[PDB]
Symmetry: D2
Subunit: 326 residues, 4 copies
Amino acid sequence: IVTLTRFVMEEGRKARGTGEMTQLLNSLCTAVKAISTAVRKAGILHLYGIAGSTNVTGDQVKKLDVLSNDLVINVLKSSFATCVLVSEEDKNAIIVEPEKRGKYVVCFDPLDGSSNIDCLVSIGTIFGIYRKNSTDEPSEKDALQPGRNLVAAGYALYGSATMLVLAMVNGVNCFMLDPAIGEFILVDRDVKIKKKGSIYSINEGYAKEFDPAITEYIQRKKFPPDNSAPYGARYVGSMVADVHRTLVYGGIFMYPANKKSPKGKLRLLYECNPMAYVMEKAGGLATTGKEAVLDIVPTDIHQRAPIILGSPEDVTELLEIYQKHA
Amino acid sequence: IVTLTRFVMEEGRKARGTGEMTQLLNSLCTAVKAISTAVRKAGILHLYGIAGSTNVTGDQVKKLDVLSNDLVINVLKSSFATCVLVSEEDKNAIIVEPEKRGKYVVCFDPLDGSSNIDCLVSIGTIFGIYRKNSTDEPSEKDALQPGRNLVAAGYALYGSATMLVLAMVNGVNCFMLDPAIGEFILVDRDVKIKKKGSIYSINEGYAKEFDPAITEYIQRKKFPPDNSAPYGARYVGSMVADVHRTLVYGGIFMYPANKKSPKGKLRLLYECNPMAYVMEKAGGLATTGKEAVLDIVPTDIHQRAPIILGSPEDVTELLEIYQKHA
Amino acid sequence: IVTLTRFVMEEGRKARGTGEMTQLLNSLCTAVKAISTAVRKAGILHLYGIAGSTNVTGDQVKKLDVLSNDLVINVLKSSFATCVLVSEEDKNAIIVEPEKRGKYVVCFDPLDGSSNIDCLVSIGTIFGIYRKNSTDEPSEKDALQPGRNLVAAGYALYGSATMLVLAMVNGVNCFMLDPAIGEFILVDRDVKIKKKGSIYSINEGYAKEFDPAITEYIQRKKFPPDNSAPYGARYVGSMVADVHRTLVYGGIFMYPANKKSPKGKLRLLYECNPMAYVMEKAGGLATTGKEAVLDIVPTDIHQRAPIILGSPEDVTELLEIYQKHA
Amino acid sequence: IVTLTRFVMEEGRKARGTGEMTQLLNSLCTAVKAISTAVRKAGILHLYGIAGSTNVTGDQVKKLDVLSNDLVINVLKSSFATCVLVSEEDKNAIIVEPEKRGKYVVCFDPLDGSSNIDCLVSIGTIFGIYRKNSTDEPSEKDALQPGRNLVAAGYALYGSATMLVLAMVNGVNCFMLDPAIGEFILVDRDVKIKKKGSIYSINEGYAKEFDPAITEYIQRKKFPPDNSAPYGARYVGSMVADVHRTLVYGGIFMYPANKKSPKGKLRLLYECNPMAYVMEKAGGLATTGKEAVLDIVPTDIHQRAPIILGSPEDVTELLEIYQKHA
Ligand SMILES: Nc1ncnc2c1ncn2[C@@H]1O[C@H](COP(=O)(O)O)[C@@H](O)[C@H]1O
Ligand SMILES: Nc1ncnc2c1ncn2[C@@H]1O[C@H](COP(=O)(O)O)[C@@H](O)[C@H]1O
Ligand SMILES: Nc1ncnc2c1ncn2[C@@H]1O[C@H](COP(=O)(O)O)[C@@H](O)[C@H]1O
Ligand SMILES: Nc1ncnc2c1ncn2[C@@H]1O[C@H](COP(=O)(O)O)[C@@H](O)[C@H]1O
Ligand SMILES: O=P(O)(O)OC[C@H]1O[C@](O)(CO)[C@@H](O)[C@@H]1O
Ligand SMILES: O=P(O)(O)OC[C@H]1O[C@](O)(CO)[C@@H](O)[C@@H]1O
Ligand SMILES: O=P(O)(O)OC[C@H]1O[C@](O)(CO)[C@@H](O)[C@@H]1O
Ligand SMILES: O=P(O)(O)OC[C@H]1O[C@](O)(CO)[C@@H](O)[C@@H]1O
Ligand SMILES: [Mn+2]
Ligand SMILES: [Mn+2]
Ligand SMILES: [Mn+2]
Ligand SMILES: [Mn+2]
Ligand SMILES: [Mn+2]
Ligand SMILES: [Mn+2]
Ligand SMILES: [Mn+2]
Ligand SMILES: [Mn+2]
Ligand SMILES: [Mn+2]
Ligand SMILES: [Mn+2]
Ligand SMILES: [Mn+2]
Ligand SMILES: [Mn+2]
């Protein structure tokens, strides 16, 4: 009954804004439908495989990585809503040409879940949007803001259905892509996560690298001291799918620092911050183990951060173990 | 270039068959496209939620469970290829009315991955097909054959794209649904699994219930005795998605017996056997820990079995630990 | 490469407008995709047949008439771009509720070609858009402006492909709906009609009712005095399809006054004016036989007018015959 | 509820056939969906325009002509149901390679309505199917049978929706393509044309070339001697669209001989015969003016014939005028 565009317009209708945000999200939706279309038949389009280079954080580049990067960059330029673009796929920020320049900075991972592409598991797109603040010429530094400054963030999940989850100041809403008329339609309004869940999600292949707090925490999930039933384990291996399930079912998702990676793996600007902002707008928590993800001031557009997120009593329980081992 | 129908006809073209198998798979494809269509927009169709009963193995029944069960049963009847139908959703086998009766028995899970429906993770449909052997009137007993007797088995995966994986006597092929013309198109021919992989997939929330062989096996994945890199962990929580990844990337998927479930959870007829047959046709192995899944003679259409499957050196390694603890 | 939204924004980008027009056309596109979707499978949705009433001009109301009317009205309200709506399906103008009120008046035929629905011939949607001028409370009178005041007009054609043809002050462009990603994509830029064509389009079943100018004109098409080849006849029987072909191939389309209908059949506000404006922006002409369609000041939202349109040398030839018989 | 495949199988189920016909129509449906898909977005695929040659009857070849010809030929080969193929696009019959040879001869117009492609009016595909009779090696002569020998004929109409109309010995049924699941679904069962209609359909641009019977007949449609209301005129200019409307609304469609074309324009094998067979199975009539289309023994695969078809009292009325002028 309500499309994403309708919803957002009937909203900024309040914020009394200039409709730029609305253009920005309209454009992104177009990118997102196009990626979704290609993804649901990638093998028929021969879109599996590498594109033959390595990106800034050292990921081998897949064909969908390239295709989805070009779609997002292009639609964002043509929106007239943006001035600085940070993409996981590009070493440096992309400044938008003056004539198409708009007020927003957008950090995004055009296709998240690379390792899961060829086995047809859920993958997604992640974005976070900042208002340019400085009056300087637009530059890479306009992307170096803490997540606490986000005006909007969320992700497209190409899962069993394609969902656009969009968090802004007042709350989180889910919009499902109807493939027939190619519109995103509101299906979940003002989403809130459960206070406590019963699923934990981490790659246990890193057991030998985990610090003692994560180690103790996982052990308590398997052998609860109060004799409750042990938590269920889930780890899809695509951040967007695992975080989405954490949102709608509750529980906790972890990609902590470990002995080989003092700052974890996941990227602060375009993986960790958008998901922490979604989680916080749903009443959840997102921490590194020692500080709120959203309060970290980045110094590098490609910097990494540990992230633990989801239901606040689950995350709090893990915080108390870190504090304990501090 | 090659659709599933073309492929199968150009095949039985050899087996010199009566084209019944081809009708059977044509019909199933129609069910599968219809379920795929509903699934990619389930929330817009209001198809999330329970249907308000409990099935034979004790699963709470979801709306998609019902919809997908009715589609599969209906298309299979109308195929003229079948005589006995076993569905996870129905307490008893369904005998097909004489006028539509054909020679095949079909065991199927019309929608697998229930727990993952509402969080939009991959779900699927699983099927295995037997030739009726007895000359008796068709009855439930015609479904009580070991998996070694399968003539065809496989599954539809509603993941990032919709894939139909179809194993028959000569090998395994993957066909991707092209949503545009609504045909399944051949994308992977004569699939073979790697001899050894580097991903393990099990719900570790059951740690406290695992027997000593599974326990030792998981510990070796995390701390390899030969100092290699530890295996990666993946557990999507839908059998079809986890098995599919095991197929195309190699490694091992486990749902073993445990202290509460001497026969594991997954159902022999319509979960374990179709996947073991796929795996064996790809050169992989599928065991309970003590015997080949495909050799078990069922006594109950809803009976459970432990299953460990995937790359033969991974499964063999786990067999040797069981033997050791025997 | 260029969607309708992109195109229109990169345009008003010039007119330096408030983006209201852009919202208006975005919304309309959503209506249009939805109608297109229903239309391409109307029989499967049981959408053929009457809805069981008679409209203001006396048309028996079809199911698609109702469905398409509700979609257009709804999306136009929710656009915040409109204040007065005139629809062929509603006796009176619909005033938009203050909170959703915008500056534009929109006259539209939500589904044109009724007689052709059940035989699956091309049908369409027609619209014309006026700026509210008065400062009075919005009322029916704001729709009573001559076509010369249009700021935008055009039509969606549900033909072999779905095309959105959009005329504004600077020219006419065609955008084709890509069903896959559900976006309208620019396919024909700055369309101009040929100066002279070689197809005439009129219902000759009305021969006995035609005035002497139309009669002489048709006879000259069949027996050209200069011995050229006779014009080809085409009459699809849906105004949108016949006018569209007149646009892209040139020639003339006629629905003149006749002995039973001094003002023809087609409705001035939402059939004749939008098509005359398109034609004039393409360099064509649109007349009643005695005056320019676009200069008629309506007194009735449902009033009829004769219309002759297309290539200027064809229309001019017919004007000269009227003048001759004057 | 009933797909084309289901319907046809539940039919030959009676004729007790070998399922070859069913394979043949399955294959054709796949061609037809593929052409439909391309057609609904032809401009986005750049598929408008000529392919740069002239075909046997002298038509300039369009891109869709080529694409649709290759799809039909390919799917028909791979069906194992055919041995000789006649296409409007190929000078000579195509003999199928022994290994894929089946018992049927198929004459088809892979894309009918060329002149209407670029203006997005309805176009279609026409087919007629004969059993090979001789025991000779298959050759062009196996296509030279009268239409009275057809076992099946009909057409796909790419109009406002895509319809497959299929006539066989017992009657005519319509199946609508559901774009969502890509199946043709039964929407009109055992179609019969009205005995008398009230629409005439002919290109009147040929007035100066019509014989006296056609001339008198058209004049009576415009000035009925019994004072009834004059017939409505319709002429879409694509045979498939005009014939389809004649079927579902009744009336008459004419492409007669004229002074320049003693045998009319339309091709006997793959335009006239399939449509005459459909019409006769619906209780209608199809004549040249002097003999039944279906009884003409062709001598040339590309030969032309006059055709007048539709409601039997309309066609009969025109027959009586020919007899009168004989
Ligand atoms: N459609 C909208 N929904 C919610 N907030 C909006 C919207 N548009 C603008 N805003 C907020 O108000 C400010 C001005 O918005 P705008 O100028 O319309 O991009 C932005 O920084 C947003 O934080
Ligand atoms: N299309 C096919 N592809 C592969 N094997 C087939 C096919 N059709 C039949 N068979 C095999 O040959 C036997 C006869 O097949 P049918 O009678 O055509 O169902 C069956 O039991 C199958 O095991
Ligand atoms: N996207 C656009 N393309 C072309 N003209 C526009 C556009 N937006 C506005 N205009 C024109 O400029 C005026 C202000 O437009 P707006 O206020 O944006 O609706 C309108 O009356 C239009 O005639
Ligand atoms: N599915 C069917 N529906 C109607 N008639 C059929 C069908 N299959 C076969 N026939 C008729 O019976 C004969 C044998 O059909 P078949 O051998 O199945 O192609 C053909 O020449 C057809 O005229
Ligand atoms: O294989 P790992 O080390 O568990 O990493 C998986 C993670 O990496 C990512 O693919 C991004 O690199 C995430 O989507 C996911 O959460
Ligand atoms: O939550 P658990 O106990 O790990 O069970 C998950 C398994 O159950 C199933 O949903 C079937 O019941 C499988 O698809 C999946 O492999
Ligand atoms: O049947 P007639 O009198 O030729 O009218 C056909 C005309 O009527 C309309 O359906 C609108 O009423 C137009 O789309 C078309 O041009
Ligand atoms: O332009 P004409 O001479 O009326 O011919 C139109 C006819 O030609 C065809 O395009 C086939 O050549 C038919 O589809 C249609 O009935
Ligand atoms: Mn990456
Ligand atoms: Mn990522
Ligand atoms: Mn990425
Ligand atoms: Mn279940
Ligand atoms: Mn299951
Ligand atoms: Mn199930
Ligand atoms: Mn009407
Ligand atoms: Mn109309
Ligand atoms: Mn109308
Ligand atoms: Mn031609
Ligand atoms: Mn033709
Ligand atoms: Mn043709």
